[PDB]
Design a binder for this molecule. Structure first.
Ligand SMILES: [Mn+2]
Length: 641
DNA sequence: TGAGGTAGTA
DNA sequence: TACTACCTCG
């Protein structure tokens, strides 16, 4: 779009596969008794993990880079309450082609096991899975921090080893929960180990043999505190230092594992166009809409609820709002609620009266509330159709970031459009889908930006579902609501929509929706947005920019949407064009620009495009509060930000 | 409950 | 997927 440059990925190309590696051994597996269908492939992979050596499951059999004579061919296996007796028959070598991706899967699996097994025999670094911690730079009062990197090893379509490296840290408590609590450290909110039925506490403990060595002390000397944020030292690295350590560790592991000499891979990068944020006029951040004016503001009524027991609006909030609305060319009406939650139903009555007099949202001035009470209050207001923005009461006028963000949140919750984009984009309706609020079940939800400008953010009623997969009919129904909204604002159907999915798109999840869209004459683009596994991106030379489009393979690409040096090293998004005919650069363009639409964050843009961020917040808040409160809440109002 | 990210933990 | 810590304010 702008300049096409160059980058490094945190992957490294090592030696190609020697002739022992291109033609892996084929092992036919025999179990006794023959398994059960749902439980076969995992059991088979378990067999591969039991024969030792570098072997993986190859379809209905096993593939091995290790000679069959240095594997435990015949063995016994326990699986969730069933004893299997396995035996492996070597059936020669089967040649695999890296160009064939289906077999490249197998080769890459073998590579991963290679990395694992070889990392096992490294003295004397700390090895957990494909991670390795090979130094210490931080200690503590009974806890130390190790420093290394998380790795991966796979094969390319060329047929050579590629090695992904990313600097990491490990938190290690070095004292038993007995000894640790004896040094003078507070109670850990979690603790990994190393009567109502006869056998007493001490008896059942010691007789279980769980007292052979350690002190007395559930127990105390029989567990270990898994320290987290509990017991500072920034574990975030500036991109430069991280890039360096990535190099160093790459070379080290390549050398100390007989994998060769690493060459940092270079990908072609493209600098994307600068988004045109707009309030009443051009802005650089949504917070500037409070001085410049709102993209679209009508006659609005906002109410105040003080729980700290005090007076009216603190003059700076009043004046800020007056500046914002005077600039937006709209009349403002501020109310004060003379009511309190301790009134019982009279409080809900107060809320009902407020709603009936046109109040669109309420600002809650209050000392730090507990999760319980905050939730109850939120939902209670919500049941009268009033979104609420909480602002903590120890609030001085100089804390401008906090209260300008609270104000922005308020305005966003009252149904105002605070910012918009001014450009040319392939889609004029962009909708994001996510599932969350998890537990025994999840909520599948959608949020949308309607119009080319994105000058309209809405949410749809989420739907309870068994897992992460959203039902096809639920997908099409939510999308239908987004469409219907678009037609309510534009008087027509959208020329083209952009479907964004948080995470990988399960098979045929969007089948129904895409068919419907196709019938109505609506062009679409389905894009899967994965927040991780995109690895890292570094400038081959020069400064690290913000707005990077890195087309990798076909239909997939990386996208660096946000970067600020002080926060650490940016993690690019991995995006897959799952369905559609729009060019990748155009989609990257639109998504990157959609990243700036989020109005509730006034001084920092989110990493995800606004509809996905909104969808995330939405399913979280719905899963947290409950869906039962949302019946009388307007969809133009972002109650969940 | 100010918001964002990058870091950590399950 | 959640949660907490620290940094800073496009
Ligand atoms: Mn908020």
């Amino acid at each position: 779009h702008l300049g096409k440059t160059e980058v490094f990925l945190n992957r490294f190309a090592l030696r190609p596969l020697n002739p022992e590696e291109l033609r892996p051994w084929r092992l036919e597996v025999v179990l006794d008794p023959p398994p059960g269908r749902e439980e076969v492939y995992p059991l088979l992979a378990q067999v591969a993990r039991r024969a030792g050596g570098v072997t993986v499951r190859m379809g209905d059999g096993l593939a091995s880079w290790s000679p069959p004579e240095v594997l435990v061919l015949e063995g016994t296996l326990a699986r969730m309450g069933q004893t299997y007796a396995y035996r492996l028959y070597p059936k020669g070598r089967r040649p695999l082609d890296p160009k064939d991706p289906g077999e490249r899967s197998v080769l890459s699996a073998l590579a991963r096991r290679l990395l694992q097994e070889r990392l096992r025999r490294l003295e004397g670094v700390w090895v957990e899975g494909l991670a390795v911690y090979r130094r210490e730079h931080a200690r503590g009062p009974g806890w130390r921090v190790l420093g290394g990197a998380v790795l991966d090893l796979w094969v390319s379509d060329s047929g050579a080893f590629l090695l992904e490296v990313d600097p990491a840290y490990r938190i290690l408590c070095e004292m038993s929960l007995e000894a640790w609590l004896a040094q003078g450290h507070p109670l850990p909110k979690r603790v990994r180990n190393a009567l109502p039925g006869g056998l007493s506490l001490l008896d059942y403990h010691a007789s279980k043999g769980r007292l052979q060595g350690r002190e007395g002390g559930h127990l105390t000397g029989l567990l270990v505190p898994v320290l987290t944020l509990e017991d500072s030292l920034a574990l975030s690295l500036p991109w430069e230092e991280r890039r360096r350590r990535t190099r160093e560790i790459a070379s080290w592991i390549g050398r100390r594992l007989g994998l060769g000499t690493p060459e940092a891979v270079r990908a072609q990068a493209y600098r994307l166009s600068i988004p045109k944020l707009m309030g009443r006029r051009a802005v650089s951040k949504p917070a500037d809409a409070l001085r410049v004016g709102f993209y679209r503001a009508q006659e609005t009524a906002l109410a105040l609820l003080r729980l700290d027991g005090a007076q009216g609006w603190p003059e700076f909030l009043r004046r800020a709002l007056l500046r914002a609305f005077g600039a937006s060319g709209a009349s403002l009406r501020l109310h004060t609620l003379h009511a309190h939650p301790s009134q019982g139903l009279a409080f809900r009555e107060a809320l009902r009266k407020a709603k009936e007099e046109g109040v669109q949202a309420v600002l809650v001035l209050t000392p730090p509330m507990a999760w319980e009470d905050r939730n109850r209050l939120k939902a209670l207001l919500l049941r009268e159709g009033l979104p609420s923005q909480i602002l903590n009461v120890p609030l001085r006028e100089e804390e401008r970031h906090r209260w300008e963000n609270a104000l922005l949140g308020l305005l966003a919750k009252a149904g105002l459009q605070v910012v918009a984009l001014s450009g040319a984009y392939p889609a004029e309706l962009a909708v994001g889908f996510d599932a969350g609020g998890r537990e025994s079940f999840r909520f599948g939800g959608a949020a949308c930006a309607v119009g080319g400008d994105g000058g309209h953010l809405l949410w749809t009623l989420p739907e309870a579902q068994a897992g992460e997969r959203i039902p096809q009919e639920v997908v099409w129904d939510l999308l239908e609501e987004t469409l219907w909204a678009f037609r309510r604002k534009a008087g027509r159907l959208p020329s083209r929509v952009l479907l964004l999915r948080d995470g990988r798109v399960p098979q045929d999840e969007f089948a129904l929706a895409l068919e419907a869209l196709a019938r109505e004459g609506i062009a679409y683009d389905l894009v899967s947005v994965r927040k991780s596994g995109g690895g890292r991106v570094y400038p081959v030379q020069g400064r690290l920019a913000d707005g990077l489009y890195v087309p990798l393979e076909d239909k997939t690409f990386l996208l660096l949407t946000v970067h600020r040096d002080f926060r650490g090293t940016p993690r690019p998004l991995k995006l897959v064009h799952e369905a559609g005919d729009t060019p990748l650069e155009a989609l990257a363009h639109q998504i990157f620009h959609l990243t700036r639409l989020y109005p509730a964050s006034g001084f920092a843009f989110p990493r995800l495009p606004a509809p996905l961020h909104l969808a995330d917040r939405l399913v979280k808040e719905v899963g947290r509060l409950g869906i039962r409160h949302l019946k009388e809440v307007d969809r133009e109002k972002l109650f969940f930000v």
